[PDB]
Structure 1
């Protein structure tokens, strides 16, 4: 399984979604989005403390991991359905 197409696609999807939110390209627990899909500050009630310089909390890790897993599953099943 290691090195296969499914493993590589899933790892790339998770890494891409985690790297987008960390470098100010995807919604996070600290930055929300307006109606014009523009990043704006949020008002999180929890206020998860994080030593990360960009304020990346564990909630962001879970959200990005779930989104990346959904994207990777969809891509893998889509490629398997078209013969690729």
Structure 2
């Protein structure tokens, strides 16, 4: 089956990886941008958007990190397919 294959594992791993990287202060999020030197500094947030998450994780945060992790997983699976590893 697909659910449980290498592609699905890699994709969920990449998506949850970016999500847990943004949630636990290891990746740039809505509330924390970066400078030229990649140091996490806060943001204006340009609207203000609420969230019940203790850290402040938002629906925008999950959309952004889902898109990034989906790009990462797509690229990884099609690369491993490209070098014959998959």
Same fold (TM over 0.5): yes
Whole-Å Cα distance in 2 between the matches of residues 4 and 49 of structure 1?
37
Q: How does 1:65-80 map to 2 (within 5 A)?
A: 65-80=66-81
- Offset of 1:65 from its aligned partner? 0.1
Q: What is the alpha-carbon distance in structure 2 between the residues aligned to residue 63 and residue 46 of structure 1?
A: 16
Which 5+ residue runs of structure 1 have no aligned equivalent? Answer: none
Report how far residue 45 of structure 1 moved: 1.4
Structure-1-length-normalised TM-score: 0.98
Per-residue CA deviations over 1:30-68 (Å, capped at 9, x if unaligned) read 001001100001001121100111011100000000000
Matched position secondary structure for 2:57: coil
Query: TM-score, normalization: structure 2?
Result: 0.96
Deviating 4+ runs (over 2 angstroms): none
Q: CA RMSD in A?
A: 0.5
> 3-state DSSP class of the match of 1:40?
strand
5+ residue gaps, structure 2, are none
d(CA) in 2 for partners of 1:46 and 1:79?
A: 41
